Every structure is written in C-alpha cells, then in structure tokens.
Design a protein around this ligand. Structure first.
Ligand SMILES: OC[C@H]1O[C@@H]2O[C@H]3[C@H](O)[C@@H](O)[C@@H](O[C@H]4[C@H](O)[C@@H](O)[C@@H](O[C@H]5[C@H](O)[C@@H](O)[C@@H](O[C@H]6[C@H](O)[C@@H](O)[C@@H](O[C@H]7[C@H](O)[C@@H](O)[C@@H](O[C@H]8[C@H](O)[C@@H](O)[C@@H](O[C@H]1[C@H](O)[C@H]2O)O[C@@H]8CO)O[C@@H]7CO)O[C@@H]6CO)O[C@@H]5CO)O[C@@H]4CO)O[C@@H]3CO
Ligand SMILES: [Ca+2]
Ligand SMILES: [Ca+2]
Length: 684
C-alpha cells in the first residue's frame, strides 16, 4: 500500500484535515433531531442544537464537496452519547451540541446517528479515500454539582446502558472531589475540576479499564485517528499507559490539545509532545501565523523564528497539527482582516511542516468571535471562492510531492513583509514565496533554491498573483513579487536511494507493528535497523518502495534510531524511537517525609527504561507533585511502567547541579499484571 493511501492510519503527513462541528454542518436526517427547547431549526441560538448529523457528512462526501475541496480526512465532534439534560447557565440555555459532555462512551450520540449510521460513515469515507478522525475526551463526563444532584445529570457515567456512577455519593472514588481548578499550576489543573466538569480519577482500575475498553470499540469500527481532549488536564503517566494499549491493538495517528497563548516554547508542552506517545495541536505555529497574517503584531522574522524554534523543541515536528483557527479562538476572519490575508495563511499552512487542519467554513470566509459565535452553521457549499480554490490546488501537493509531507524547511529570502522558504526531501524540492504587504510589490534579487535548472510555473496558476521563475542551477533570475502575492514552484523526481520520511507510531513494545513511510525503498525486502539490531524476513510484514511495515524486535527497552537498508545502501536515521519493556500499567508513587530546600525538587528513577534506567537527567521522572492529592512533605506522581515486573527505584532531590539521593537500599515493588496501583514509601 502506498504511504499515500487511505489505509495509512499511522501517518497523517500527506493529508489535510477538515475539522467540523457535526451539529453545525448539515442535518442530513431531520428524523433524529432533538425535540423541543433543545432544538433551533433556524440555528440562530448557537448554544442549542441545529440538527447537523452523520447523514449530512455522508451526503457531502457523496456529492464530492470534500473531494473537490481537496481535504483527505475529516475530524468530527466526539461520537459518543452525551447528557440529554439542558443546563441554564445564569439565564442562558446550553446543550451538549459540541459533543464534550459525555455520559456513555460505549454508545453513539443519537442526535448524530446510530451505530449503523456511523459504520456507514466510515465506509462511505474510506470509499472516497477520506480518513475519519474522532474527538475523544477521557478527562471528564458532564457538568455536576456535588451538593445538588438535580443539576444536569450529576455527571453520571454509563457502561453501555449500565450505570457506573454519579458525582454525588461517589463512594468508589471514580471522580476527583478536590474542588475546581484555579489554573494556578500544572498539578492544580490535573487533579481538580475543569470548571464544573466531573473529573475522572484514572487511578481507579475500573475507570482505567473502561477507557481502554471504550477506545478499542471505536478503533474496531475503523476510525483512523484520535484527537484527545484536554491532555494538559490528565496525568502524562496514565495517558502514556493508555496510549501503549492503543498502539498494541490498532495503532492510529493520535494528537492532543494542550492550549498555549503565544509562539513561545513551553517546557511542559514540549515534554508532553516528546514523552507521552502522542503529538499536539501546534498552538505556537498558530500564534505566530496570526500575529503575522491576521493581527499585524509581528513580522516575517517572528514566523521564521518559530519554524526554527519548534523544529528544535519537538522530536517529530512533522506530527504537530497546524491551523489558522478553530473552536477555541476567534475566527481568523474579521471585517478588519481581508480575504487575501486568510488565503495567504492557508497557503502557508498547506505548504508548511506538520499535519494541517482547516476549521469548517474557512473556505466560505465564515466570521464569528468567541464561543459559541465561532461555531456558526455552515453558510453555503459554493465551490467558487478564492479560498476554496487555493485549498483544492495546494492540498493535493501533500500527496504528490514528498518534499511537502516529509521535508525540512530552509529560509531562502526574508524581510519584514516578504518570506521565501524552501521545503526539501531527497531530490524533491518546493519553494514558496509570500508577500504579506497589500499595497507594494517587492523586487527579489539573489534568490537561490535547490530547484534544478528549468523554468517553473506557479502551482497556484496565478490566483494569488503568483508568477513564474527561471532557475539556473538554483540561482533564480530577478523577478517582482506583486503586492499580496504568493506563489509555489516545485520539482518532483523519483527517489533512487532509501530515504525515511516518517515512522508511526514512535513508541511501542516488542511485538507491535510500526509504519515506515518514505521513498526509494525498492520492492526487494531488505533489512530494518533499530539501533544496531537488524530486523529481517518474516519480522518485516510488508515492504514497498514507499512504505515498510515492521515488527519491533525484542531488544532492551530504550531510545533508538531507525534505519532502512535497501540493497546494501543505508538510509537516513529517524531518531528518538521509544521501545518499551512490555505492556504498561499506571502506578502512583508516593513518598513521605521528603522535605526540601527552597527551589529544590524531588524526582524518581529506577531499574527500567520507563523510570530512566538509573538516570538523573531528562529521562528521570518528575518533578513530583505535592499539593492536590498529597501535601508537602509527601510527594506523588503517576508513572507509566511495565506490567508484572519487579522494580527497584529511589527518589532524589535536585536543585541546581547538586544531586542528593535517598540513602539505604533501593525500594522494590512488583507491578500488577494490568490496571493501576499505588505504592507508598518513606524517604530514606
Ligand atoms: O463544557 C466546557 C467547555 O468545553 C469546551 O471547551 C474546552 C476547550 O475546547 C479547551 O481548549 C479547554 O479550554 C481552554 C481554553 O480554550 C483556554 O482559553 C484556557 O481558558 C482560560 C480562559 O481563556 C480564561 O478566560 C479563563 O476562563 C474563565 C472565564 O473567562 C470565565 O468566564 C469563567 O468561565 C465560566 C463561563 O463564563 C460560563 O459560561 C461557564 O462555562 C460554560 C460555557 O459557557 C459553555 O459554552 C461550555 O463550554 C464548553 C466549550 O464550549 C467547549 O469548547 O461549558 C462551560 C461549563 O461547562 O462556566 C465557566 C466557569 O464557571 O471562568 C473561567 C475560569 O476562571 O481562564 C481559563 C484558564 O484555563 O484554557 C482552557 C483549559 O485548558 O478546555 C475546555 C473544556 O474541555
Ligand atoms: Ca439531524
Ligand atoms: Ca483532570
């Protein structure tokens, strides 16, 4: 199967995701519409239901709205059953139209459709070569008040009809009862309620099993990717464990939402993206893009800086999901923001690194500030807008040109208003030039690219006032980049040598199957390398010129680099591939009496790769928590660790560069075969 096909559940780099709020798109079947006060046929009261459902998505796939638009994947609202009650928030009536107020993760939301409608959606999508990604929120259920059970549905959870439990009288501790987060710290936001939403206590084995089971259900229905909600409000440890169970079953591209306010590096966010097993919605990319194109608060240098900075911080930048806007911010379009700028931001995104996502209605220049105003009904299906055009012309390049999907980025020319960058992968190159200035053109001189000698046409056919160029061994002849212009020139050729473009997923236990997408692998089954270990024959389940499916060998757990060797020729190395010890389980380490010095933090390390393998650096677990679940001088941390294994571990305090360990012997604990556990020790 080519890396490009719809069957590629492990990589979304050659795709273009279209994020759509199911209720606001198209009510294909009015027979499932809510009844009474929860419904608004006109769709003027954005807090109520408008009727949009799965049949609507099906319809638009069938009449090629999406196929002509160029999108190759749909990201939909959370498919599960949500609370039926209505909530009056200080005068205003609110409904679960957004899909975020889950009540039963094992059943579908009747308003969107049935199980059948859903399967029918998967089938129709795959038939047109469109992947399906689902929103999934395991952090909570619905809004609930501990004291008043008559508010909404008191956060009650169901296991395919069977009641598991509500927020009040939660004797079993299925939820956290530590008040509501004030967002003052990472820990405060993980173990307290996100507003009035009942927060799941994932340390509870029932809850742990429920979510692994529940996700298997949807994977088994053929979903191709998962968008995890509120990753910054759940423990990294649990999540990683959860992720390894997903990858051991049916690996699918998975990314989360860790909100950020600027393009500035955020340590925790970087750490999550590199250690959790999933990637993230790229908020740094978003900010920089808006500062430059929408708000005029930054110039091209800010944009280039972010490109570099992000590429440096994230292990696999090609896995971050990019966008110009979405449901958590103002629509890109304002009366004060002109069309050409929106169009430029699209073109920029479509050609830049990562996995691009377009919030529905962007092609129709939809406006709307704040929640719920930015989630208005799809206004029209005209295929005539300039923006609709750009998407259809640029999107396909993600599949046809590997420089775009897998390439690096090099700044070729820049100044306050002009930016010219180059995407390159093997012999395939792509050059994009943008002039955000709306009134004045720019004379470009001395531009060099890797474009071979020849004359190149603007891939956009001049619709954004682009021009053609002539290369003489990279040296492009002088030309003028018109006002508000943007052009794409590219060169594609067949790769002759093995060259890896993507590997998915990048975490697993021996025995799993990963996907290696690239070029020049040739059709002769060669050899795969995990560090020094050669993997050949039957262990390589599939081999093609552009994609290899291989099985993780039984080597020591750790960080590896992956190489493909085709016909004695070695390819480039894809770094930071994590090999786990085996199945995972989440364990909460607790240590008492660990008093510290001002600015001194407590960490944890032990005898397995998952605990750092006795390291005191970036591989050590921590810094531990000491406020919500357990107060200082007791510290705690939820860590993903190997199932049924005897572990040796010790805590250690670190301030500046001086390390102080626990004395005595190492602590030992044998982990359960599955589920979760708590182990409490005393600082030595
Ligand atoms: O059901 C909840 C909610 O779910 C969805 O939203 C999710 C969103 O997609 C995620 O990104 C994330 O939210 C992050 C957010 O995007 C970031 O901006 C940031 O949030 C900060 C705020 O920006 C900042 O303003 C402040 O927040 C304070 C508010 O300003 C203040 O008004 C008040 O909030 C109260 C609301 O006014 C009130 O109406 C009620 O809220 C309900 C909403 O009206 C209703 O639409 C719905 O919201 C959905 C939303 O539509 C989905 O997109 O339900 C809400 C209640 O269930 O109650 C509010 C609280 O009383 O107080 C807040 C806090 O002081 O600070 C925050 C700091 O974080 O980060 C967010 C978290 O990362 O998660 C949400 C939820 O999953
Ligand atoms: Ca409907
Ligand atoms: Ca939480």
């Amino acid at each position: 199967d080519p890396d490009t096909a719809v069957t590629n559940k492990q990589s979304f780099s050659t795709d273009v995701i279209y994020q759509v709020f199911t209720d606001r798109f198209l009510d294909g079947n009015p027979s499932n519409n809510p009844t009474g006060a929860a419904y608004d046929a006109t769709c003027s009261n954005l807090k109520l239901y408008c009727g949009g459902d799965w049949q609507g998505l099906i319809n638009k796939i069938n009449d090629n709205y999406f196929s002509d638009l160029g999108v190759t994947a749909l990201w939909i609202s959370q498919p599960v059953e949500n609370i039926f009650a209505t909530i009056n928030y200080s005068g205003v009536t609110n409904t679960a139209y957004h899909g975020y107020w889950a009540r039963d993760f094992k059943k579908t939301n009747p308003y969107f459709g049935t199980m059948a409608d859903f399967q029918n959606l998967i089938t129709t999508a795959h038939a047109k070569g469109i992947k399906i990604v689902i929103d999934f929120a395991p952090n909570h259920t619905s809004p609930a008040m501990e004291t008043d059970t008559s508010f909404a549905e008191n956060g009650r959870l169901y296991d395919n009809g069977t009641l598991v439990g509500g927020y009040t009288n939660d004797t079993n501790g299925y939820f956290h009862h530590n008040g509501g987060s004030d967002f003052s710290s990472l820990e405060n936001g993980i173990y307290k309620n996100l507003y009035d939403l009942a927060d799941f206590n994932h340390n509870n084995a029932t809850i742990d099993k429920y979510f692994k089971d529940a996700i298997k259900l949807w994977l088994d229905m053929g979903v191709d990717g998962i968008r995890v909600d509120a990753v910054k409000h759940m423990p990294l440890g649990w999540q990683k464990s959860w992720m390894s169970s997903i990858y051991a079953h049916k690996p699918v591209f998975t990314f989360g939402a860790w909100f950020l306010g600027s393009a500035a590096s955020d340590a925790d966010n970087t750490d999550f993206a590199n250690k959790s097993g999933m990637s993230l919605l790229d908020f740094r990319f978003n900010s920089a893009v808006r500062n430059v194109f929408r708000d005029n608060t930054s110039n091209m240098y800010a944009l280039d800086s972010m490109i570099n900075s992000t590429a440096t911080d994230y292990n696999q930048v090609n896995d971050q999901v990019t966008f110009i806007d979405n449901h958590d911010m103002d629509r890109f379009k304002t009366s004060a923001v002109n069309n050409r700028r929106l169009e430029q931001a699209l073109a920029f995104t479509l050609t830049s690194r990562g996995v691009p996502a377009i919030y529905y209605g962007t092609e129709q220049y939809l406006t709307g500030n704040g929640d719920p105003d930015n989630r208005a009904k799809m206004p029209s299906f005209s295929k005539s807008t300039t923006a609709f055009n750009v998407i259809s012309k640029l999107a396909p390049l993600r599949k046809s040109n590997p420089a775009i999907a897998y390439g690096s980025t090099q700044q070729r020319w820049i100044n306050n208003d002009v930016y010219v960058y180059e995407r390159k992968f093997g012999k395939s190159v792509a050059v994009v030039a943008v002039n955000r200035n709306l009134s004045t053109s720019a004379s470009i001189t001395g531009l060099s690219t890797s474009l071979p000698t020849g004359s190149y046409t603007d891939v956009l056919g001049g619709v954004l006032n682009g021009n053609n160029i002539t290369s003489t061994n990279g040296s492009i002849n002088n030309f003028t980049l018109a006002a508000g212009a943007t052009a794409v020139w590219q060169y594609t050729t067949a790769e002759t040598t093995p060259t890896i473009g993507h590997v998915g997923p990048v975490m697993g236990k021996p025995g799993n199957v990963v996907t290696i997408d690239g070029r020049g692998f040739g059709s002769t089954k060669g050899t795969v390398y995990f560090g020094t270990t050669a993997v050949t024959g039957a262990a390589i389940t599939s081999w093609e010129d552009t994609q290899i499916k291989v099985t993780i060998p039984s080597v020591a757990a750790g960080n590896y680099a992956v190489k493909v060797a085709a016909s004695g020729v070695n390819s480039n190395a894809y770094n930071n591939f994590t090999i786990l010890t085996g199945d995972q389980v989440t364990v909460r380490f607790v240590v008492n009496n660990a008093s510290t010095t001002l600015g001194q933090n407590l960490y944890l390390t032990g005898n397995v790769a998952e605990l750092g393998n006795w390291s005191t650096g970036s591989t050590a677990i921590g810094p531990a928590f000491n406020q919500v679940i357990h107060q200082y001088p007791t510290w705690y941390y939820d860590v993903s660790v190997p199932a049924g294994k005897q572990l040796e571990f010790k805590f250690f305090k670190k301030n500046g560069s001086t390390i102080t360990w626990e004395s005595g012997s190492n602590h030992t604990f044998t982990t359960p075969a599955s589920g979760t556990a708590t182990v409490t020790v005393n600082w030595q």
